[PDB]
Amino acid sequence: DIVMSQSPSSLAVSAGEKVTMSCKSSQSLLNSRTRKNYLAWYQQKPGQSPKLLIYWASTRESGVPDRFTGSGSGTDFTLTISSVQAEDLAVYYCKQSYNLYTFGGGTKLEIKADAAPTVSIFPPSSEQLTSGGASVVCFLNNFYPKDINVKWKIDGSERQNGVLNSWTDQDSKDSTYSMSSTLTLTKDEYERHNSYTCEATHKTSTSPIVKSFNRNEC
Amino acid sequence: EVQLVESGGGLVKPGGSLKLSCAASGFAFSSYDMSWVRQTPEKRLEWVAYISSGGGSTYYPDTVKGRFTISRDNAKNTLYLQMSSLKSEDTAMYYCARPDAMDYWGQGTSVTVSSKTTAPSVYPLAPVCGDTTGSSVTLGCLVKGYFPEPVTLTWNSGSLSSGVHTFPAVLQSDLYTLSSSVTVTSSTWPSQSITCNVAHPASSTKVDKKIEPRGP
Amino acid sequence: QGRGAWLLMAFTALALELTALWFQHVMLLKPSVLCIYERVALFGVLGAALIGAIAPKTPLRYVAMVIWLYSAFRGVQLTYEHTMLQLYPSPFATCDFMVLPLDKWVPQVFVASGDCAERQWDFLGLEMPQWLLGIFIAYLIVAVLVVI
C-alpha cells in the first residue's frame, strides 16, 4: 500500500511556540485534475478518539484555530501549530486517502517549569483484608518533571519486592505528570510491623517528601 | 449534535466470532458512508471496513477481507461490524467513523483476542483513619486482579470528572491492576457523598463502591 | 403538444446525444466507462419521445411522459455520482470487479474496454462529461414543467 511515516516520534515545547512536525508518504498524493493532495491530519488527545484537523492538506476543519496549518504537496507534508496552548497535548496522525486509508505512526507533542509532587498514603480496605489480602498505596499527584524516586518505608526498615507504579501520561489542562505506587502484601504479612510510609525525591528539591500512617487502628 | 456510540465486544478466543454495532444518532444517517477503524495496542491505526451510504458497496483491507463484514441498518440507525475467524492480531480498540475524511469518531469498543476472563475486584480507598483534617482531601478507588483491559472507572456517575487521576493498569502475572485518585475540598467530602463506579465490559461488571470514612 | 413538438425533442436528443460518438476519437478520450450505463438514459428519454412521438394527441399513450420523466431522472442520479466521482473521487483507485450488450447491428454505441480514470485531462473549453447534468436537468425540467 502507501506507507505514511512521520518524524519525529516526540516533540517538547514551552506553551506558546511554533512546532512543525512532518508527514511523508511513499506515493505521491496529487491528482492530475485539481491540485488535491488527499492527505489528512488527525489529532488524538490522551485516551480519546482522534479528531479531524486538516483535510485535503491545506484546508482546516469547522472550529480549527488558524494556528494549526497544513502545508505540503506531493510526498511531503508538514503540520504546523503556532501558539501551543496547554490543551494541545496529543499525538498527531497523518492519513492518506488517495488509495485506501493509511496512517502515519504518530508524533507525540508533549508539553514543557517544575512543581512539587503531592503525596498521600492509603491503607488497605476492610473488605480486601477480610477477603484474604492487603494492599497499600500512595498517590503522587500533580508533579513535574517525570522523574521521581518513590521509596516505601516500614517504620524505617525498607523492603522492595512487590511495589508496582504508574505515571499518568502528562495532564492536558495543567500539563503535569502524576504517579501511583502500590505495595501489595499477603493478608497476614501486613501486620508484621506498625508504621508505614512512602517518600518522593522529585527534583524540585531533593528533600524527600514524606507521608505516613500506622497500622494498629486500621 | 451528531453522535456515535459503538459497543458490544470484550474478549473472544482465537478463530472466534463477535459482532459490534455503532449506534448512530444525530445526523442524516442514510445519506453518509460509514467506516470502522481499530487502534492496536501499539497505538497504531488501521482502517478496517467501509460501507457505502446505501449498503451498496463495501471495502476492506486485505488483512480482514474475508473475515469481516460491514453491514448497516438505517431502519434502526445502527452500523455493524461482524468479525469472524478472529486473529489475535485483531486485538484492538474499535472506532466507528464518519466520512464526507473521518469527521465524527466514536469512542471505541475494546476487543481482545487471547485464550480467561476475570471480574475485577474493587476496593474503596478511604484516607488515614486519623481525624487530622488537611484542606484538599483526596480519596481513592482500587481495582485489582482482572482480565482483560480495559475497565471504566467513573467518580460519581461521571459527575466527579474535574480533579481525578486514573493510572495505567499493570501486567503482574496475567491480571491487570489499576488505581484511582480524586482530590476535592474538605467541604465537599464526608458530608457530601462520593462513590467510585467501575465497569468491566469484557466481563459485564457494574461494581459500585461508596467511599466511607473509618469507624471501628 | 404535437407531432412536431415531440419529434423536435426526440430529434434534438437523438442528435445532441448521438453526437456523443463524434470527435470521441481526436479528443484522445475513447473510454466510456460508467458512461455506458448512463448512455442508456438517452434511449430511455429519447425512447419515450420517439415512441410517444407517434403523435401527442389522438394517441392516449401519453404515458410517454412518465417513462420520459423516469429516464430523465434516472439519468441525473447516475450522471450526478459520476460528477461527484471527479470533484470528489473515491479511495478505490482500483476499478470495479477487483474486490446486456451484444446486438445484431453493432455494439459500438456502448463500450468499456480501455482504462480507468487516469490521464483524462479533456481541456475542451469547460469539460463535457459533466455538462450532461445540466442537459438532463433540461429534459427533466421540461418534463416536470409539462406535467407539474
PDB file of N, CA and C in Angstrom, chain C residues 38-87:
ATOM      1  N   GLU C  38     -24.895   5.110 -18.317  1.00  0.00           N
ATOM      2  CA  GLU C  38     -25.583   6.397 -18.472  1.00  0.00           C
ATOM      3  C   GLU C  38     -26.059   6.670 -19.886  1.00  0.00           C
ATOM      4  N   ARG C  39     -25.413   6.056 -20.876  1.00  0.00           N
ATOM      5  CA  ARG C  39     -25.835   6.273 -22.245  1.00  0.00           C
ATOM      6  C   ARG C  39     -27.278   5.838 -22.311  1.00  0.00           C
ATOM      7  N   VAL C  40     -27.577   4.754 -21.584  1.00  0.00           N
ATOM      8  CA  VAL C  40     -28.938   4.199 -21.502  1.00  0.00           C
ATOM      9  C   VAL C  40     -30.007   5.285 -21.237  1.00  0.00           C
ATOM     10  N   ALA C  41     -29.751   6.202 -20.311  1.00  0.00           N
ATOM     11  CA  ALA C  41     -30.705   7.282 -20.026  1.00  0.00           C
ATOM     12  C   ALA C  41     -31.152   8.028 -21.301  1.00  0.00           C
ATOM     13  N   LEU C  42     -30.287   8.120 -22.318  1.00  0.00           N
ATOM     14  CA  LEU C  42     -30.668   8.781 -23.591  1.00  0.00           C
ATOM     15  C   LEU C  42     -31.792   8.069 -24.355  1.00  0.00           C
ATOM     16  N   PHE C  43     -31.712   6.746 -24.497  1.00  0.00           N
ATOM     17  CA  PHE C  43     -32.746   5.986 -25.202  1.00  0.00           C
ATOM     18  C   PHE C  43     -33.956   5.838 -24.282  1.00  0.00           C
ATOM     19  N   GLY C  44     -33.725   5.977 -22.978  1.00  0.00           N
ATOM     20  CA  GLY C  44     -34.812   5.920 -22.022  1.00  0.00           C
ATOM     21  C   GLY C  44     -35.734   7.092 -22.319  1.00  0.00           C
ATOM     22  N   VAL C  45     -35.176   8.310 -22.245  1.00  0.00           N
ATOM     23  CA  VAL C  45     -35.945   9.533 -22.530  1.00  0.00           C
ATOM     24  C   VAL C  45     -36.258   9.702 -24.016  1.00  0.00           C
ATOM     25  N   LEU C  46     -35.270   9.446 -24.881  1.00  0.00           N
ATOM     26  CA  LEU C  46     -35.492   9.527 -26.335  1.00  0.00           C
ATOM     27  C   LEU C  46     -36.501   8.457 -26.696  1.00  0.00           C
ATOM     28  N   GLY C  47     -36.359   7.269 -26.085  1.00  0.00           N
ATOM     29  CA  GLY C  47     -37.273   6.147 -26.337  1.00  0.00           C
ATOM     30  C   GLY C  47     -38.713   6.610 -26.186  1.00  0.00           C
ATOM     31  N   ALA C  48     -38.994   7.234 -25.043  1.00  0.00           N
ATOM     32  CA  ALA C  48     -40.324   7.787 -24.731  1.00  0.00           C
ATOM     33  C   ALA C  48     -40.806   8.810 -25.772  1.00  0.00           C
ATOM     34  N   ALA C  49     -39.959   9.801 -26.068  1.00  0.00           N
ATOM     35  CA  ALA C  49     -40.278  10.847 -27.052  1.00  0.00           C
ATOM     36  C   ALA C  49     -40.474  10.263 -28.451  1.00  0.00           C
ATOM     37  N   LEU C  50     -39.541   9.407 -28.862  1.00  0.00           N
ATOM     38  CA  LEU C  50     -39.597   8.726 -30.176  1.00  0.00           C
ATOM     39  C   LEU C  50     -40.759   7.711 -30.225  1.00  0.00           C
ATOM     40  N   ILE C  51     -41.033   6.991 -29.129  1.00  0.00           N
ATOM     41  CA  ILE C  51     -42.174   6.056 -29.116  1.00  0.00           C
ATOM     42  C   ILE C  51     -43.514   6.799 -28.984  1.00  0.00           C
ATOM     43  N   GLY C  52     -43.552   7.781 -28.076  1.00  0.00           N
ATOM     44  CA  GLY C  52     -44.739   8.611 -27.878  1.00  0.00           C
ATOM     45  C   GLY C  52     -44.893   9.568 -29.052  1.00  0.00           C
ATOM     46  N   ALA C  53     -43.780   9.768 -29.769  1.00  0.00           N
ATOM     47  CA  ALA C  53     -43.750  10.648 -30.937  1.00  0.00           C
ATOM     48  C   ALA C  53     -44.891  10.315 -31.907  1.00  0.00           C
ATOM     49  N   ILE C  54     -45.356   9.048 -31.928  1.00  0.00           N
ATOM     50  CA  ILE C  54     -46.443   8.650 -32.845  1.00  0.00           C
ATOM     51  C   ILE C  54     -47.393   9.819 -33.105  1.00  0.00           C
ATOM     52  N   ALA C  55     -47.583  10.638 -32.063  1.00  0.00           N
ATOM     53  CA  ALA C  55     -48.447  11.813 -32.094  1.00  0.00           C
ATOM     54  C   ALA C  55     -49.004  12.054 -30.674  1.00  0.00           C
ATOM     55  N   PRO C  56     -48.615  13.179 -30.075  1.00  0.00           N
ATOM     56  CA  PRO C  56     -49.036  13.598 -28.724  1.00  0.00           C
ATOM     57  C   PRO C  56     -50.434  14.308 -28.365  1.00  0.00           C
ATOM     58  N   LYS C  57     -51.527  13.735 -29.063  1.00  0.00           N
ATOM     59  CA  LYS C  57     -52.770  13.931 -29.431  1.00  0.00           C
ATOM     60  C   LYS C  57     -53.608  12.656 -29.469  1.00  0.00           C
ATOM     61  N   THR C  58     -54.222  12.361 -30.644  1.00  0.00           N
ATOM     62  CA  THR C  58     -55.108  11.186 -30.820  1.00  0.00           C
ATOM     63  C   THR C  58     -54.587  10.024 -29.963  1.00  0.00           C
ATOM     64  N   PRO C  59     -53.310   9.693 -30.041  1.00  0.00           N
ATOM     65  CA  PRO C  59     -52.784   8.614 -29.211  1.00  0.00           C
ATOM     66  C   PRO C  59     -52.685   8.993 -27.631  1.00  0.00           C
ATOM     67  N   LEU C  60     -53.466   8.247 -26.874  1.00  0.00           N
ATOM     68  CA  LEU C  60     -53.572   8.414 -25.413  1.00  0.00           C
ATOM     69  C   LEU C  60     -52.328   7.878 -24.699  1.00  0.00           C
ATOM     70  N   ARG C  61     -51.455   7.204 -25.448  1.00  0.00           N
ATOM     71  CA  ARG C  61     -50.218   6.612 -24.927  1.00  0.00           C
ATOM     72  C   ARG C  61     -49.305   7.704 -24.196  1.00  0.00           C
ATOM     73  N   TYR C  62     -49.918   8.830 -23.882  1.00  0.00           N
ATOM     74  CA  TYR C  62     -49.230   9.924 -23.199  1.00  0.00           C
ATOM     75  C   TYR C  62     -48.258   9.410 -22.128  1.00  0.00           C
ATOM     76  N   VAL C  63     -48.448   8.156 -21.708  1.00  0.00           N
ATOM     77  CA  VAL C  63     -47.596   7.561 -20.698  1.00  0.00           C
ATOM     78  C   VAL C  63     -46.173   7.957 -20.988  1.00  0.00           C
ATOM     79  N   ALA C  64     -45.919   8.269 -22.266  1.00  0.00           N
ATOM     80  CA  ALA C  64     -44.596   8.713 -22.708  1.00  0.00           C
ATOM     81  C   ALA C  64     -43.962   9.709 -21.728  1.00  0.00           C
ATOM     82  N   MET C  65     -44.800  10.475 -21.040  1.00  0.00           N
ATOM     83  CA  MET C  65     -44.328  11.442 -20.091  1.00  0.00           C
ATOM     84  C   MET C  65     -43.587  10.744 -18.822  1.00  0.00           C
ATOM     85  N   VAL C  66     -44.274   9.788 -18.245  1.00  0.00           N
ATOM     86  CA  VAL C  66     -43.736   9.095 -17.093  1.00  0.00           C
ATOM     87  C   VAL C  66     -42.426   8.385 -17.439  1.00  0.00           C
ATOM     88  N   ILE C  67     -42.421   7.628 -18.527  1.00  0.00           N
ATOM     89  CA  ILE C  67     -41.209   6.953 -18.947  1.00  0.00           C
ATOM     90  C   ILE C  67     -40.083   8.006 -19.290  1.00  0.00           C
ATOM     91  N   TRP C  68     -40.495   9.143 -19.866  1.00  0.00           N
ATOM     92  CA  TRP C  68     -39.580  10.289 -20.157  1.00  0.00           C
ATOM     93  C   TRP C  68     -39.120  10.867 -18.826  1.00  0.00           C
ATOM     94  N   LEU C  69     -40.068  11.006 -17.902  1.00  0.00           N
ATOM     95  CA  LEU C  69     -39.752  11.538 -16.577  1.00  0.00           C
ATOM     96  C   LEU C  69     -38.780  10.587 -15.922  1.00  0.00           C
ATOM     97  N   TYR C  70     -39.123   9.290 -15.915  1.00  0.00           N
ATOM     98  CA  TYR C  70     -38.274   8.266 -15.274  1.00  0.00           C
ATOM     99  C   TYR C  70     -36.852   8.286 -15.802  1.00  0.00           C
ATOM    100  N   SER C  71     -36.697   8.104 -17.105  1.00  0.00           N
ATOM    101  CA  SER C  71     -35.370   8.083 -17.733  1.00  0.00           C
ATOM    102  C   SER C  71     -34.560   9.390 -17.576  1.00  0.00           C
ATOM    103  N   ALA C  72     -35.232  10.534 -17.549  1.00  0.00           N
ATOM    104  CA  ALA C  72     -34.534  11.801 -17.347  1.00  0.00           C
ATOM    105  C   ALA C  72     -33.953  11.838 -15.933  1.00  0.00           C
ATOM    106  N   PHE C  73     -34.777  11.459 -14.947  1.00  0.00           N
ATOM    107  CA  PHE C  73     -34.341  11.414 -13.543  1.00  0.00           C
ATOM    108  C   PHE C  73     -33.265  10.360 -13.342  1.00  0.00           C
ATOM    109  N   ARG C  74     -33.564   9.136 -13.783  1.00  0.00           N
ATOM    110  CA  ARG C  74     -32.621   8.032 -13.678  1.00  0.00           C
ATOM    111  C   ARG C  74     -31.274   8.492 -14.233  1.00  0.00           C
ATOM    112  N   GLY C  75     -31.297   9.300 -15.282  1.00  0.00           N
ATOM    113  CA  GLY C  75     -30.055   9.799 -15.846  1.00  0.00           C
ATOM    114  C   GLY C  75     -29.325  10.704 -14.861  1.00  0.00           C
ATOM    115  N   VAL C  76     -30.073  11.585 -14.189  1.00  0.00           N
ATOM    116  CA  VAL C  76     -29.455  12.523 -13.252  1.00  0.00           C
ATOM    117  C   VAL C  76     -28.739  11.797 -12.127  1.00  0.00           C
ATOM    118  N   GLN C  77     -29.403  10.806 -11.517  1.00  0.00           N
ATOM    119  CA  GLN C  77     -28.806  10.057 -10.399  1.00  0.00           C
ATOM    120  C   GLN C  77     -27.472   9.375 -10.751  1.00  0.00           C
ATOM    121  N   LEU C  78     -27.441   8.680 -11.894  1.00  0.00           N
ATOM    122  CA  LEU C  78     -26.213   8.043 -12.378  1.00  0.00           C
ATOM    123  C   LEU C  78     -25.161   9.101 -12.844  1.00  0.00           C
ATOM    124  N   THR C  79     -25.574  10.148 -13.586  1.00  0.00           N
ATOM    125  CA  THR C  79     -24.611  11.203 -14.018  1.00  0.00           C
ATOM    126  C   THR C  79     -24.071  11.989 -12.841  1.00  0.00           C
ATOM    127  N   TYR C  80     -24.923  12.273 -11.864  1.00  0.00           N
ATOM    128  CA  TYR C  80     -24.501  13.045 -10.689  1.00  0.00           C
ATOM    129  C   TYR C  80     -23.347  12.358  -9.946  1.00  0.00           C
ATOM    130  N   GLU C  81     -23.507  11.065  -9.633  1.00  0.00           N
ATOM    131  CA  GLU C  81     -22.444  10.329  -8.956  1.00  0.00           C
ATOM    132  C   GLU C  81     -21.175  10.406  -9.779  1.00  0.00           C
ATOM    133  N   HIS C  82     -21.323  10.327 -11.090  1.00  0.00           N
ATOM    134  CA  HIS C  82     -20.174  10.464 -11.979  1.00  0.00           C
ATOM    135  C   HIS C  82     -19.523  11.845 -11.833  1.00  0.00           C
ATOM    136  N   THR C  83     -20.329  12.893 -11.634  1.00  0.00           N
ATOM    137  CA  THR C  83     -19.770  14.231 -11.482  1.00  0.00           C
ATOM    138  C   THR C  83     -19.051  14.288 -10.158  1.00  0.00           C
ATOM    139  N   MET C  84     -19.707  13.743  -9.131  1.00  0.00           N
ATOM    140  CA  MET C  84     -19.140  13.685  -7.797  1.00  0.00           C
ATOM    141  C   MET C  84     -17.779  12.919  -7.803  1.00  0.00           C
ATOM    142  N   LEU C  85     -17.750  11.793  -8.483  1.00  0.00           N
ATOM    143  CA  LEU C  85     -16.544  10.989  -8.579  1.00  0.00           C
ATOM    144  C   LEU C  85     -15.326  11.758  -9.141  1.00  0.00           C
ATOM    145  N   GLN C  86     -15.513  13.012  -9.567  1.00  0.00           N
ATOM    146  CA  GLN C  86     -14.385  13.845 -10.032  1.00  0.00           C
ATOM    147  C   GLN C  86     -14.099  14.941  -9.007  1.00  0.00           C
ATOM    148  N   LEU C  87     -15.122  15.708  -8.663  1.00  0.00           N
ATOM    149  CA  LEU C  87     -14.961  16.778  -7.684  1.00  0.00           C
ATOM    150  C   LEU C  87     -14.875  16.147  -6.282  1.00  0.00           C
TER     151      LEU C  87
END
